[PDB]
Each structure stands twice: as C-alpha cells, then as structure tokens.
Ligand binder design. Structure first.
Ligand SMILES: [Mg+2]
Ligand SMILES: [Mg+2]
Ligand SMILES: [Mg+2]
Ligand SMILES: [Mg+2]
Ligand SMILES: [Mg+2]
Ligand SMILES: [Mg+2]
Ligand SMILES: [Mg+2]
Ligand SMILES: [Mg+2]
Ligand SMILES: [Mg+2]
Ligand SMILES: [Mg+2]
Ligand SMILES: [Mg+2]
Ligand SMILES: [Mg+2]
Ligand SMILES: [Mg+2]
Ligand SMILES: [Mg+2]
Ligand SMILES: [Mg+2]
Ligand SMILES: [Mg+2]
Ligand SMILES: [Mg+2]
Ligand SMILES: [Mg+2]
Ligand SMILES: [Mg+2]
Ligand SMILES: [Mg+2]
Ligand SMILES: [Mg+2]
Ligand SMILES: [Mg+2]
Ligand SMILES: [Mg+2]
Ligand SMILES: [Mg+2]
Ligand SMILES: [Mg+2]
Ligand SMILES: [Mg+2]
Ligand SMILES: [Mg+2]
Lengths: 65, 102, 61, 89
RNA sequence: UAGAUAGAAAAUAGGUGCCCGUACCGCAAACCGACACAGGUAGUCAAGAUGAGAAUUCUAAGGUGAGCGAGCGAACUCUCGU
RNA sequence: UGAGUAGCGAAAGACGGGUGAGAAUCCCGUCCACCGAUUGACUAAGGUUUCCAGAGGAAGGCUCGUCCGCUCUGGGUUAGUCGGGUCCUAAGCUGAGGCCGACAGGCGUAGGCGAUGGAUAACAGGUUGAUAUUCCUGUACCACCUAUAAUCGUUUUAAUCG
RNA sequence: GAGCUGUAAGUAAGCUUUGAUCCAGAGAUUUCCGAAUGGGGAAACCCAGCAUGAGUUAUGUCAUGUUAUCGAUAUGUGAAUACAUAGCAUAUCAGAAGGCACACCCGGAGAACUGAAACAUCUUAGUACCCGGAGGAAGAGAAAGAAAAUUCGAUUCCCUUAGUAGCGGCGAGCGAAACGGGAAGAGCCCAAACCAACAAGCUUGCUUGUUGGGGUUGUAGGACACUCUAUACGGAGUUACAAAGGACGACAUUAGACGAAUCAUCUGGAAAGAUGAAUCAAAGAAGGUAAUAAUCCUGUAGUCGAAAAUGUUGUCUCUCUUGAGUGGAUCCUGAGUACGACGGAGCACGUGAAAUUCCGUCGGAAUCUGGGAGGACCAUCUCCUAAGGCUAAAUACUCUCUAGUGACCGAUAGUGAACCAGUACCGUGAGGGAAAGGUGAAAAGCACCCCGGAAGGGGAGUGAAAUAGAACCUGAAACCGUGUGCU
C-alpha cells in the first residue's frame, strides 16, 4: 500500500492494518519453508507496507507532540 | 545515452559499418546498445541446456553507443542529437535538420 | 596530592648537586602542618603551610 | 509478538516422526523462552500445548570459495499438543 | 523473643515450574607436543584361574591387528637365545 | 645436486565371497593372533561439529584406496528433579564513603564478586542412523498457585507469621 | 528520465513513464556490547526492584518506562551532644565522565645508548617515553619595556644581526639579543580612594560585611573640589572592550542543465592511422570508443539552475552608553608582596664579578619627597610604574573534504596491503606479519564427434589470433626431455 493511501487511514485503521499485514507475512513465511509459496516477491511487498504503515503512524505521534 | 530503445540508427564503426537498424535493447551501465542485424554472434548452445535442441545460435551482441549514430528524419543521414526545451519539456532535436528526432 | 589549603603550596622538583657537580633529582617539600581551621563555617583539619600560618592569616579553631 | 516469536516450521525426518507423536518442531527467536513459545503457538494455531522442549544450536562454519563464515545460531522448539492439531501444510 | 496481624489449614481436586550446558573425541589419529608424532593429560569402574596382592602368567566383558608391501635369508649394526 | 638414495613412526595375519575402471590395503564371513588394574567402560579439562546418512576420490592420508577425523549435500544435541544460574561462602579480587601519593595511581572500611568446599526435589524400562535421569512408558518427589477443606483462631490477643 | 531488484554471474518472483532504480537536502527507524550507568559479569550475557500495562481461575510469563557514581542546587530529617554539625533521605540538572588526529599547543614528570676518539662536569636533551589540560589553533600580549637618537611605543611571526657577543673539564661543544627590513595590527576591564542603599556590632559612636555607583594611571592618574557638555543627539557592540534576539537581502556549499564542429577512400577483425576534401574553436584539458579522434561518445570553454539544509556577509532592527577641562589641601594607586639569606632551577650565560626571573625554607620593605630598571655595586642621569585580569590578526599542524599538480612508482616498485590485508599465518599475551594484477574488441567461454571412470586429449566450431581456453598479454635463464650432423 502506498503512503498516500496509508495517510488516509485513521490511526485505528493503520494499527489494524499493521496487525493484518503482519499475519499475512507470517503465513507467507510458513508457506515458503514448506515450499508452497511460488510468488516470492510478495514477501518483500508486505514488509515494506508494514514499514510504511509504521512510518506514517510514527509521523502522527511526533506531530501530536 | 543519447540513443534510446526503438531508435533507428546507422552504424558508423565496426564490421557492420554503414548498416541501419532499430535498437532492440540498451545497456546504460556498459554504454552499449543492441541493434537488429548488427554484431550477430554465433553462440554454442548445449542440448543439455534447458532448451531441448542443441546447436550454434546466432543473436545480436551489444555494440558501443558511440559507434551507432541517430538518423536525421528529413535526410535519412547520420545526425548528432541536440536538446531544446519546448513548453518546459526537453525535446530531442537533430543537429542536421533542427527537426524533432521523435 | 598534598598542598597548602590557603596558598596551594606544593612540593617542587630540582637537583641535588655534589662537589663534583654530579646531579640527582630531588624534591623540596612545603612545611605543611595539619591544623584545625574554619572551612565553609565548619571546623575542619587541613594541611596548611607555616608561611600561610605566619601573621595569623589563617584562623585556627 | 507471537508471529515474531516463531520464525518458521521445521520439516525433517526426525521432525516428521515427532509429528506422528503429535510433536511439532519450529524455529524460534533466540531470545524467547519456552513459555513465550507456548503462548505464541496457542494464539496462532488455537491449540492446547502439552509441553515445549527447547534446544540451542551453535553457529556452524560454512565455506564458499575462499570465503569462510558461520551459519546463524538457531533455537529450536519441539511443541507437543495435548489437544488439537497443527497443519503446517 | 523484638515485633506483625484473623485468619491458619490435615486433607482433596485442578493447575504452574525459567535460563545455560547436553552432539562427538576425551591414556587420545579429535586435548597439549608444527605431524593421523613410541611423550604429557585429574578422577571413576575394574570379572575368572593363580596369589598376600590392583604383583605375575593365561583368559572374560569389551576392544584391536596398529595406513606401505613382496622376496632373499650376505657383510655390518641393533634386539634376543645358547 | 645428493638420488630413485635415507626413510615410510613399537604390532599378526591368512583365505574365501562381494564391490569396482582399478583392490595386499574397502565391505562381509571364517580362522588366527593382541590387550584385558586394560588397547575395556565412564568422565572433568581442552577441542569445537571432528557426530549421522547419502555421495565423491582432485588435494590431505608417509603406499594403495572403491575407503576416511578429507571433500560435497542434507541431517543430529529436547531437563521443575543431572551440572551451573535465579542459594552460600574460602583463598583471592573489587571496593561508596575513607587514607596516602609529582600525575598516573596505591591502599582500604562497609558492601559486593568469587568453587576446588556447604545447601539442594526421579527412578526403572523402552526407543533412533545420529539424544536421553532430557523423548516415551510406568511409577515418584519438590516448590508455588487457585478452589473446596476435616479442625483451629478471631485484636493486651495466644490460631498464625516472626 | 528508462530501465531496475549491489558485488555476482544465474534462476525465480516481481517493480517501473500513474515516473523504478539512481542523485542531493531533510526526516523516521536505529537489536546487543561498549564511558555503559539497576545489580553482576570471563564484552556483546545473566539476574533484579519499582510503576504502568498484557495474559492467567491464579501462580508462572511478557511489554513499556524508570532505577550507577560523583558534582552542583534545593528540600526534609538529623548522632555522640543543649543548641546544630555530621550523617541520612528526596527532587532537579543536554553538569562531568569516555573516545580520538601515531599532527600542532601548554603544563607535570623526565632517560639512555651517544659525543667528548676513555670518562665523572658537560653532551645526547629538556630529546624519547609517560601523565594532565586543551583549542581550532594554543601560548604570548597593551611596558615596573628596549635604549642612549631629532628616541621608540602591546604581543606574535619572517629576514637580518651572526656562527657574532658570549658560555665552556675555555674540552667536545653550546649560542643570543637590541638595532635595521618586513607580515599583521586593537586595544581593554578591574582592586583602592569616594558616594548611596541594606545588614550586623545595636554608643542606637561610626566601624565592619554585601549590593549599586564611581574609578583605572607615568605627560603620573584617579578620588575630592569646581566649571562646561550629553540623556542616546551622537557613539559602540556579541572577536576583548556588557549581553541575548528578530526581519530582509546578497553570496557560497550540498543534486543538476545546456553546451561548436567530418565525411570519403585504402590497409585491417576493427580506423581514430594513411590519403584527399572539409569544419569548429571563449571549446586543440582529459578519458573512452575494435589501432593513435579538436569535429563518435563522456566531456572541455562559456552559460544557466536549488524545494530544502548549512555557512558567510550586508542593511535595518535590537541592546548598551555622557563626553571634556581647571586646581594643587587631603585621600587612593594590588604586602607576607617586593626584597634578602640558604638550597635548586631557568636565563645562549656550567655560580661566576652574575644583573634579569622562578621554586622550597626562613626572615622581611617603601608608599609619589614612593617604587622598579639601564648585567655586581654606588652616585647621577634617563626610561618605566610590579605584586589583578581580558584581547583579534599575522604563526603551527593535517585524521578529513573538494579541486588539482608532479623531468614521483608502475606489481621484488609504489603503502605492510593495486587482489575480501592488519587478513592468512605465528604467539599465553603485549605483539609480529605475508603471498597473491593482466583471456578477448566483444564471452562470442569450445554445439557436436572420438578415446577415457574421470582427468586429460584429438577433431569440429568461435575468434584477427586458442601456439588468446581460464593466475588464459608477452614468456628470458637455470633446469628437464625427444631427435639428429660431427665425435
Ligand atoms: Mg535444554
Ligand atoms: Mg553423550
Ligand atoms: Mg600423572
Ligand atoms: Mg598385568
Ligand atoms: Mg648413496
Ligand atoms: Mg643403500
Ligand atoms: Mg630402504
Ligand atoms: Mg606405521
Ligand atoms: Mg595416495
Ligand atoms: Mg565418522
Ligand atoms: Mg574513591
Ligand atoms: Mg584496592
Ligand atoms: Mg563444586
Ligand atoms: Mg552416542
Ligand atoms: Mg521524484
Ligand atoms: Mg548494565
Ligand atoms: Mg665516549
Ligand atoms: Mg669514542
Ligand atoms: Mg590565547
Ligand atoms: Mg563580549
Ligand atoms: Mg560535442
Ligand atoms: Mg572515418
Ligand atoms: Mg640563589
Ligand atoms: Mg650600568
Ligand atoms: Mg608490493
Ligand atoms: Mg611483471
Ligand atoms: Mg609486501
């Protein structure tokens, strides 16, 4: 998810999105070990989204202070 | 590189000097480009390789960007490239004619 | 790490000279004497040189 | 942190034999304790864990070309389930 | 005992119990001696016949045939018997 | 060069059957021999994957090699109770304040740290190619928690903690 | 501005003109150890308290924050011991710590081999080493100066003076300064007299302590008395001279953009070469491109550009602030100081005739009719005005950055290190410390066939070349073979 879309999400929405995205990553990691994952590039995309989600959230907290 | 993929360029240097062809691909880091029908190389291919058939394969190999020269649209002759900003946008201009290359 | 509280007088280094002018490093120490004096309005025992004590510059408690 | 605690599943001959006995082997974070692993497995897989046995593996030297180096240290947890089952696949 | 404070519990049932080490060699080809080196390396266990005995000779449990061989059976050197 | 010379590091092997491009040297079998207060079984140091399976034969192996502590690939170490820590202390070390000393720093009190000693609850059997008082089975023990508690107490207390 | 997912190939899955990768400015995140700081510890680990939160029937478990020491400032308690002082407890602090640039500076402490053809004074040398404190520079600095002119006017640094004057077992050797020529320049603030306020001793005498004002010197100056001048008019400033700010502009740095002019032929694998004919130049620096290119590419001259951050600077703003005379009655002008003796040290100067200046010990002035210096000392004369501070520049150095340069090296050289090097290796440790570059223009890196278990090779093919086939440019000698003419 691009930062612009993430910026639209409310703090609560971001928090929930991070959790859901983290779960997706865990599933992907388990699939890869079992050899069930073909789309390897998916893993990277999820990671950067979670990083973005975290970045946008951090900006808000700094802004509040 | 002044030369871009899909340009029609004359070869001004090498064995293939005096041949005009489209640019199939460009390698920015090596400053080399591939032009159709230029610098054809015969490569030994194993049938042991993933491709079932094994034989000598003829494909174009990269040539230095300096060796190729863009062709002026008006004259169909080798021209250098000049850049002129139009409506805040840089446009490729042939030195020979002064027309837009593309 | 021993010096007069009042003057800051401390040991110095120099040479001990023989008649043949042979030299050996030596020290001159201050005549420091431990005396009770008033420090920060409270009686305290500190090392003070006799020179400082002379003329009652330093009160002794 | 449950997703962070359990890094990946472990599939080996000895692991597969354990699975028949209802023991599931996982690679976990080196810092985590066995109790953390128990809670983590229970949350993710919604199963009841009978016990967790944990081991540490030392870094093993691996050579490629002239380059000499060690593999990452591993902490492996074997989790026995009293109730329920985990499907890794 | 000084102190502290309404609660304490024989039992019974249910539950909770972390980290580190754990492979393998370890009188040795894996340790200390540059070596797959006749050297050094704490401790524990240690059967039978013989015997005072953990000596001695031959065996047990268990391990081992030693990481160059084949000939010939001179001098000479070493080790050994008369 | 010396030179195809010195050496190839204490020892008993023989044969048959395998394997393989190749076998005195690898595997298996029989016989023979050697150790046996030990060449056996543990185990602390120390080493650190040398452990197991499959594969290989360049190099390493004082010969050879189909083999290996070698090379490649994938595996293997499971603890409330075992050893150490969440216990204790010795020598020693360190040391708030403190004492001393050109500087750096030295010494030292309280207090810490520190096993080679003290305290301290699990045993038998089974199981893998590679782990076992760790897994499994059976049968235990210890500490703590929650609940229900025979009984006991119920504010100078007299149950209880200390 | 079209590719991209480092080296690092390759495979896979993807990303990107709805602007990837990439480049610069700013920001977020930033495990654990380490001053390492909750405690401990064999660094990168273990074990806790407290608060709050998560989870659990509950315990176990987990998360976040916080908890060292010393110093300073407060606050509250407070021993022997009446008062209160230790002491103790709590709170706050961008307080300190530790690191480094193997350089420069200042200071503490301080060798020896060596030289003297021995060696003790002396020399090496106040060097190396060690330790402390720094700063971007440091240190020094506005005359108790240098001198002897018609004097000069803080300090530092350069030239020169001069290998002079001197010092010296008068040996070895050590070695100025002033003047003169230059670089660079900047001056200042206190203490005291005195005045005002406050507090204490309560003569409640006016004597102390504190604050503010005042005042700052050799032409003696100041207080004091008196007379003009001025309330920031002016003047000055954060580099000293007092100390924070704001606004705007300019320039610079940290990405970039544009940027002139060549074709043909011959040889060749390839042209930049040769040959012929042209062209540009504020650009004929340089590198690359299939051989040697001003005109092919990257550039070069020239010109242009910054959202943001930083630095420098200018102008306002802001802040601060009276400046001068005359008088000679009284007062003030840095004391255990100067200075002396003794023992040392430092001065180019080795105790000497030893001025000048510091230290330890001990003794110990004067007060403007004062005091210090002019190389013992005295007189005279002359020049200064100690015992309190601050101060830019000219100077030193280079871990580093940016742009460049070399009658510097070219793989046994140049760094130890052109390469996965402070590595491999060696050592208990401190520490010592290597070797090792080159296919080709392009990987076109030898399909296929044959012998062989493989290795290796013979063909075939790629290529200008394989006698360029992988540490693959060239390929010397030693040394090892095979054949042969003569012997
Ligand atoms: Mg364990
Ligand atoms: Mg074992
Ligand atoms: Mg012994
Ligand atoms: Mg015997
Ligand atoms: Mg011989
Ligand atoms: Mg012989
Ligand atoms: Mg022999
Ligand atoms: Mg042998
Ligand atoms: Mg061999
Ligand atoms: Mg083995
Ligand atoms: Mg201390
Ligand atoms: Mg001590
Ligand atoms: Mg013990
Ligand atoms: Mg075993
Ligand atoms: Mg952009
Ligand atoms: Mg700590
Ligand atoms: Mg001499
Ligand atoms: Mg001599
Ligand atoms: Mg200075
Ligand atoms: Mg100032
Ligand atoms: Mg150009
Ligand atoms: Mg041409
Ligand atoms: Mg004297
Ligand atoms: Mg004179
Ligand atoms: Mg070199
Ligand atoms: Mg060379
Ligand atoms: Mg070298």
């Amino acid at each position: 998810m691009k930062a612009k879309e993430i910026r639209d999400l409310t703090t609560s929405e971001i928090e929930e999105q991070i959790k859901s995205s983290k779960e997706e990553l865990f599933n992907l990691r388990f699939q890869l070990a079992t050899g069930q994952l073909e789309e390897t590039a998916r893993i990277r995309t999820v990671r950067k989204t979670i990083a973005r989600l975290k970045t946008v959230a951090r900006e808000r907290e700094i802004e509040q202070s | 590189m002044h030369i871009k993929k899909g340009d029609n360029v004359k070869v001004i240097a090498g064995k293939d000097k005096g041949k005009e062809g489209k640019v199939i691909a460009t390698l920015p880091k090596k400053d080399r480009v591939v032009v159709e029908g230029v610098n054809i190389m015969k490569k030994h291919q194993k049938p042991t390789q993933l491709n079932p058939e094994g034989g000598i394969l003829e494909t174009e190999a990269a040539i230095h960007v300096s060796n190729v020269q863009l062709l002026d649209p008006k004259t169909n002759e080798p021209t250098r490239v000049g850049y002129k900003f139009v409506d805040g946008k840089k446009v490729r201009i042939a030195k020979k004619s002064g027309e837009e290359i593309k | 790490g021993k010096q007069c509280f009042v003057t800051g007088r401390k040991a110095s280094t120099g040479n001990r000279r023989s008649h043949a002018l042979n030299s050996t490093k030596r020290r001159w120490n201050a005549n420091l004497q431990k005396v009770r004096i008033l420090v920060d309005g409270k009686p305290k025992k500190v090392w003070v040189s006799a020179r400082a004590l002379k003329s009652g510059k330093v009160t002794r408690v | 942190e449950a997703r962070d605690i359990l890094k990946r599943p472990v599939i080996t001959e000895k692991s597969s034999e354990a699975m028949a006995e209802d023991k599931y082997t996982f690679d976990v974070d080196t810092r985590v304790n066995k109790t953390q692993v128990k809670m983590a497995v229970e949350e993710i897989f919604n199963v009841k864990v009978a016990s967790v046995n944990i081991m540490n593996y030392k870094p093993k030297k691996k050579r490629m070309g002239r380059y000499q180096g060690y593999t990452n240290k591993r902490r492996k947890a074997i989790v026995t389930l009293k109730e329920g089952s985990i499907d890794l696949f």
